[PDB]
Amino acid sequence: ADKLFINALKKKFEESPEEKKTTFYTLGGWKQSERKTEFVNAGKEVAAKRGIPQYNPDIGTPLGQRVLMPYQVSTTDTYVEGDDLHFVNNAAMQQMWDDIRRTVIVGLNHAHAVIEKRLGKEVTPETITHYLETVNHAMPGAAVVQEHMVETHPALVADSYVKVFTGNDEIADEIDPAFVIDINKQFPEDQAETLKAEVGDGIWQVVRIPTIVSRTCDGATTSRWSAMQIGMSMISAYKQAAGEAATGDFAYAAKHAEVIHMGTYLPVRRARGENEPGGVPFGYLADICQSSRVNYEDPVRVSLDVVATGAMLYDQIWLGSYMSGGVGFTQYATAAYTDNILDDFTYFGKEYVEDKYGLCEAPNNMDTVLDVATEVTFYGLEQYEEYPALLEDQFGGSQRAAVVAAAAGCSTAFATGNAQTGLSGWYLSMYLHKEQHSRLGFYGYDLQDQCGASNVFSIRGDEGLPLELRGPNYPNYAMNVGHQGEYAGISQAPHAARGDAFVFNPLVKIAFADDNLVFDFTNVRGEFAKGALREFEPAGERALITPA
Amino acid sequence: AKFEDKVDLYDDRGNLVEEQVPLEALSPLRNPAIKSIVQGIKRTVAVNLEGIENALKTAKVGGPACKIMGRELDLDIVGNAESIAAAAKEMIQVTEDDDTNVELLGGGKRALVQVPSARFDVAAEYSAAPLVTATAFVQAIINEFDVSMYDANMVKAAVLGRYPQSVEYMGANIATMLDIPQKLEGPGYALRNIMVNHVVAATLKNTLQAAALSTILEQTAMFEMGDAVGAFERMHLLGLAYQGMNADNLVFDLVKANGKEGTVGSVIADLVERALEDGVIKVEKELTDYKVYGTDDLAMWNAYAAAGLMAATMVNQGAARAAQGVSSTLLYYNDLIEFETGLPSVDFGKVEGTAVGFSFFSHSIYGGGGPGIFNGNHIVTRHSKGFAIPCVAAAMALDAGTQMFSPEATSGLIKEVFSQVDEFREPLKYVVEAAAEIKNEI
Amino acid sequence: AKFEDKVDLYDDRGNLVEEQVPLEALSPLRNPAIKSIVQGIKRTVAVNLEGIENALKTAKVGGPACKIMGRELDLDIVGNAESIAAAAKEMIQVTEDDDTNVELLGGGKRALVQVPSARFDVAAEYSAAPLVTATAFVQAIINEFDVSMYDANMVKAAVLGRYPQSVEYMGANIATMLDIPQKLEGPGYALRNIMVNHVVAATLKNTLQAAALSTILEQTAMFEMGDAVGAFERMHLLGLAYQGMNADNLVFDLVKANGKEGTVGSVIADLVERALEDGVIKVEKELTDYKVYGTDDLAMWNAYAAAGLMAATMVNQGAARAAQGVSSTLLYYNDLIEFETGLPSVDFGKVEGTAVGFSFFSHSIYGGGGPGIFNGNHIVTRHSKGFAIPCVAAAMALDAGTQMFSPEATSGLIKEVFSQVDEFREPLKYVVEAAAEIKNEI
Amino acid sequence: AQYYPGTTKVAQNRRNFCNPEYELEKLREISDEDVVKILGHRAPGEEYPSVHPPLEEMDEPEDAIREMVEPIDGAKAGDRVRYIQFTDSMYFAPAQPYVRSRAYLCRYRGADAGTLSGRQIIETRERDLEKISKELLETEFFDPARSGVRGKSVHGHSLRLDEDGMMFDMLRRQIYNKDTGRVEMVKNQIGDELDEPVDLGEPLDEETLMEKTTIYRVDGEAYRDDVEAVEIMQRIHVLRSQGGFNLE
């Protein structure tokens, strides 16, 4: 069959994909583009209205001396100009982040012990249901105890709610099912049994605070907001004194002792509280993505859906805005989720591994790393050499480095069943690529690359960590595009090949298996396409409280 | 000596040990036992070998509920604890027979580690203790079992957790009484970020020893912060002596006189009487059926009032055998004593203010918790400059089992290891002995 | 004793000082001059009395462009500096004949303050230096002029800035080489958060002394971090010796041979020759017209390569008398030497990686700056474990005036005060002399 | 010195560019004035601006390192640090980005070299830059169709060639003349128009590009077929990996 990127290349250019020559400078610059044309007109209107010049195509250099390309969102039939994949212009992308930022997981295990042991009252599925009806009134910002409270408008906060899950089926089935994430419904049988065994008789809340609040405030708001309304709901539902010494145990439990944040806080140079992108470890990002529970028979699809999730969040929103800003980093990320290019390379590697070793059956050692990562790296680079249209598409060396190494690293992990040797393969790919083409990425691309081999298996304080536990705050990784989302993919890869239900945290995996989320985490690339087409409906808008 | 004051020193049974010791013999800057306690706290680490082994066996590393399927390693760490500990000690020490200690506890399940003091003399701060200990045990475990290059990173994760992706050692299986330097509310706060429950655990719930350890740590931090420099130094030293070291047996005697039937109010009455008898306060003027008291020595009035505050906590929370009301005692001892006398309360209102917020944040939805999870670095309880937290330690020592987040729940690893250290466990003994030893050098 | 290695030590003129010194005589853990330097940097503060006076006179307190109209206070601080400094010293010292130093500079405009070492022995960390110094000068100024209760808070703002509303001493008129503990990238990092420009300032742009001070601070941090514990210890010690202490005159001799006409490449060629002659490396295999080198001593190869890296920086940035290309030297010395030999580069690729990001973040829009504003705690330049930043110090020492953010711009207060201290200014001298003194005790 | 492993023409060309004893082939003559025009930092006849006084006018303290390291001429004078930057087509340009930076720090003193996929730069003292730039422009480092002098808007290394064999340039600084078969530089490296264009000679023909190139490609010499070069890269990976773990 044709290589998977051929259709996209034929869409972009008039020449066949193998053709070496073209003609430039004849397209009218920005005038070739529907989207740039929209922007020019919008800039004129904005400037006229506000009395300050704004977007102007004649500032600086003239875009569009070459073809301004459409991109195929991989696994879809949607082709869009890249501007439609900019996070500012894509409500799906914004909502994906909001849905993560506004979520925390909060145990009821200490709270129920407080109830039974300190209050001396019983906990049953019936009392849990009563508590859940209470907290689903309170959580969006409504009152349960005091007189003369003023409250949030329910329609502005319709996206906020609380569900629970537990590994005990009989207990789960007795709680009102409106409130329950049903593990047996959402996961295939073998994954469900793994997840239920991890959770056991524990009972966990998945709390989502309002998008409008998360946007007004920050990620570190989420666990606090959660805890306030859990606290009020414990008081109301279990008929407690409204503020006694035991009230503080519920607070400490919900805020500290049994809360799981999506992200941990950051050091001062990049100061941020919890639930910001830099704090989200790669294994959590893989577990947030829900491809694993839908596409389990295809480990490539699962791994590359995680890459898409992470490339967007980590490069476009996090590195491209939180840590920089401006035009930003759309195409550093799109390279990893468009034109089916990473898909072509990674299926090649998966098939190579299947045939030679069997998935997860290669020795977990440097011999396998050298074999697989080298073979896959040479395949990917050959494609850029064979197809001039492909090279002109992924025009930045960084983009090519990330894509080729992601395929090499995922493939190596498909072979070993271990993310750490996958990671070693990623760095070997970079070194080979650099020598082959006498170039790699942007000026600063391979800081982590060159530290990379030595720090894969280090055990020292700020060096040694399994890949699943690393994240955007791992020191070498803290600055640069074209790595973080790909590492989340490599983290996913051996687990997808093994058939594991999760990568690093089963609670995080279960917590996003929920169709009441605004973004559909089972189909991240489909959602990015829907947002690009301006067909995604986000939460958090203020239309109800502003003029018509 | 800079100051003229002398104090009589007593033991934790209320028996005289040494008369008329210069106040500065109790100073953190002068007392060799306080130096030894502080350097000990900087250098001591609890290692949970059982915890490391179980984390490895299950691949549960990196924080709560985390697990990496396929990464499991089954190593007989506890069964080889002696060899591992000896190998770690050779890496931790600077020279053979220096003050490095590595002692197994609980049949090899735990280790007490005291990193050599010399490492801290050429360090900026205290993080060498967990970091040197962690890497020595990671390396010793790898070498004991010839763990491969491919797997060794799991040993690292089992020992130190998610660091450096997390700022903290998230999921670690080592523990210290101190916490990381990034978590300081302000520079100089490190000896304040020590959970009350840890102090109570280390001192085995001996009320006077818990109060003493807490006071030593709080007031030593006041020197590091600069609060006990210049004009304020004597105030802080007198507070250390009278509130935390039972100087002149004043705390002890107030508790004795009020323990059978007394209240916070009856302790106040006795303290005001004692202050008058000792010439610390005097009637300044008469209103209608009301005496307005004054003092020519505000620092000494503050210290007497602080001793009464400790005794009131011991009487009130001791009678309940329930710690929660310490927030109330800290508030109303101070509120009451001001309207009883016309003099300012302990720390010129800052204990009362701390107590207002501490009461709120131990009985409300918004944060805090039970008394034992507070500390001098906690945003709720940082405001008084050493005069509040030691009472919280006394109250938790006296709690008979009313707390969910008890020292048994929060501080078990720290109890097992740190209570072994005599100076940590019975600091009142060692600080008084050192003060007596240096009394003619001050 | 633990290691058999011996090194020959030289002065900054390339003259032998002492032959065959045991390697561990240079260890931060053993060398008393390194201890003295580290404790000195913990305890030393620069006080800008002129700056305090001007901030008060204008009410410009609390950070850039801030001012409080109506709060101006006109106090003759510099004219009364002797009295103010003596009063401050009485509060800062522990005892009258201890190692407290308070020395006026610049006609009373500045003061050198060295807070007594004993305060740090009973402290968790190092913040006692600015905090004790600040309050002693605030109190001394208030007392000198009888500043009222109503106005004294302005003196506090002029000295220490917006702290505690800000986490840092924002707007302060004191300075230290260290920065606050909250700004550490990781535990154990404090001796790394020392701006390169500060090192160059303290050492008066003497290239070898700047390299030595930077290496001492970096490699001492590697001990505090636990990186130089166990398997890695000898690597770090050899790196300290050969890259920062000019052991065996290797840096000096490579510079001498390449200074007239040489390049990074010619330095590499000479270093490989020298490693081969000394038996550090040997040909392992012959490919087609290409020798593959091996080593039986990776730590020693690393140290030789590190010495060549320093010499290459001195030759390349020395020839330009412009520091910017140090990011390039750090990258391509290491890239070239790997393909020249088949051996790993300095710090096994970590210098090269540091250099990639440092190059980017000193020639791009995204962050960083000129070479002088980096440090071992900077996110860009933390990755190599001591083998990169000392080259940056050398390059900035050699810069003839091409930098906007020069030491003259960023480090003037530091320069005036910290260059007064002999052991800070000429550390190579004192560390070598101390090594020679303890050579038979190792 | 060895410089680079491998048995291909590519590998030999990489070694030759690095080896300061290898005489770079001169392919074209460019006047001093035209190098200055191409650089675009000063006008012909304009004095060199300074960033600091001449070293002689400074009163520096004794420093053995300074004494041993001869400053380059522009450092003695106090010249500004300025740059020249090249983009090299992946369709067989003779020089390529890491080839340049590696070679520059073997051949040139006092050099700040940076490598990126689409651009490679050297910064050094202005008068010295002018001398180096002549060599970079006149010799086989440069082909006027497949290489470009570009201080901004560098896109093109990875693009298809145009029908004349010229690399893409958003700013069209180098124009192929069909009548002469020669390329003219019509703008300086930042894109400002030159009063008079500069002759850059004929593009190299395909045969000669293949002789001279330092990029490995499947349709040239493939890296995977230079098995000794691959072997050394893999060796460095393994030795770095082992070293970071336990120094073995």
Ligand code: F43
């Ligand atoms: C000014 C810099 C230096 C710097 O610090 N950042 C720049 C510019 C910056 C700007 C460019 C926006 C604009 O044009 O106004 C932004 C978008 C960041 C922002 N401020 O929003 C950016 N780069 Ni850059 N930058 C990119 C890239 C690159 C590639 C482009 C090579 C090529 O042949 O075209 C090269 C590095 C390399 O050679 O590897 C590069 C360089 C550079 N990058 C050169 C300008 C190059 C030039 O003069 O043409 N970027 C890429 O390789 C692809 C992704 C792309 C980013 C935008 C996105 O992700 O959509 C953009 C990311």
Ligand SMILES: C[C@@H](OP(=O)(O)O)[C@H](NC(=O)CCCCCCS)C(=O)O
């Ligand atoms: C005390 C502290 O909580 P913790 O004890 O750390 O859980 C802190 N909250 C607050 O200060 C809540 C302030 C807002 C609600 C009460 C307003 S009167 C915080 O979340 O950081």
Ligand SMILES: C[C@@H](OP(=O)(O)O)[C@H](NC(=O)CCCCCCS)C(=O)O
């Ligand atoms: C280096 C550091 O900048 P400073 O040197 O502290 O200004 C840091 N920026 C970054 O790491 C930028 C990362 C995103 C842009 C570059 C992507 S390759 C930050 O802002 O905290």
Ligand SMILES: [Cl-]
């Ligand atoms: Cl007093």
Ligand SMILES: [Cl-]
């Ligand atoms: Cl060694």
Ligand SMILES: [K+]
């Ligand atoms: K926000």
Ligand SMILES: [Mg+2]
């Ligand atoms: Mg097929």
Ligand SMILES: [Mg+2]
């Ligand atoms: Mg077509």
Ligand SMILES: [Mg+2]
């Ligand atoms: Mg206009």
Ligand SMILES: [Mg+2]
């Ligand atoms: Mg439903």
Ligand SMILES: [Mg+2]
């Ligand atoms: Mg915590």
Ligand SMILES: [Mg+2]
């Ligand atoms: Mg749906």
Ligand SMILES: [Mg+2]
């Ligand atoms: Mg008696």
Ligand SMILES: [Mg+2]
């Ligand atoms: Mg009475």
Ligand SMILES: [Mg+2]
């Ligand atoms: Mg003195």
Ligand SMILES: [Mg+2]
């Ligand atoms: Mg007065």
